[PDB]
């Protein structure tokens with residue numbers, strides 16, 4: 001039968017990077033800072049053990065408060081669960097600490113991608129075929145992420161990573177941790193989200209993500225941001241001018257009272273002609289967009305339905321658009337202390353088995 005009686009502890013080494021100390025296993029070499037954020041820093045490196053170029057994220061003060069602690073656990077679980085080509089997955093996760101008492105840091109190793117969707121667009125114009133392959137993968141990814149009952153909630157170009165051969169992976173899904181002041185004003189952060197989730201209407205389903213995919217594809221085709229609004233309200237108006245104002249049907253389904261109340265007061269207007277906005281676009285694309293850009297979430301196309309759309313005919317392969325196992329998110333409805341979230345996280349680290 002054979003069992004592993006004793007696991008060997010790799011030998012780490014320190015070095016200062018990004019004004020912060022990075023202690024990692026000697027397998028990872030040539031660490032170079034590629035970014036930062038309020039969640040932790042990121043370094044590109046070379047994994048001599050696998051010959052792969054990898055991305056390493058060092059969370060910053062992962063257990064400094066219940067809110068942080070729980071999120072640190074949440075991220076580890078999300079990464080551990082995803083195992084699909086178009087979704088960022090966990091290649092390794094380590095901590096220099098030798099025991100739960102010492103435990104303070106968490107490093108998450110993932111694949112490395114040449115760039116995010118922003119960078120690419122600025123570099124050149126993409127062919128109708130490029131858009132097809134690019135959007136096709138986002139949908140393959142979402143199909144998989146959604147099947148494990150997980151919603152992204154914040155899909156946008158900065159979350160989509162691609163590389164030289166046009167291959168894409170989805171990042172930062174299921175995290176939904178943003179303070180309202182970064183989503184205020186003329187900011188690209190709030191230009192790709194569904195109106196329902198932006199102005200907190202009814203509840204939202206997986207289709208919030210399909211609306212985002214709509215805004216991205218529109219952009220890749222036209223070369224311009226579809227709804228570049230200056231604030232939540234201006235943003236909503238730009239959207240309504242194109243898709244039209246709510247209708248009795250969807251209006252009743254809007255759970256929020258103040259919201260429902262404000263929508264009513266808006267002067268009404270019909271759905272514009274999509275062929276006149278996304279011009280010079282493959283006609284099949286225009287059709288897919290009219291099925292992605294619908295105000296009512298109950299009537300928005302799903303990722304699996306969309307893979308079946310004639311536009312992705314050259315890439316659609318049902319015998320190769322995998323689904324995930326269900327994600328067990330019961331922990332999400334718990335209220336534990338920092339040390340309890342930490343302990344759970346610690347367990348998830350020493351129990352991680354490297355992919356084949």
Ligand SMILES: Cc1ccc(C(=O)NC2CC2)cc1-c1ccc2nc(NCCN3CCOCC3)ncc2c1
Nearest residue numbers: 055056057078108110112113114115116171172173
């Ligand atoms: C490590 C990690 C851990 C976790 C998660 C994550 O999503 N967790 C959520 C799902 C649960 C993501 C990463 C991660 C982070 C940044 C990345 N950046 C690049 N692009 C670098 C090239 N650039 C482009 C911009 O300009 C400079 C150069 N490639 C791959 C990356 C992988």
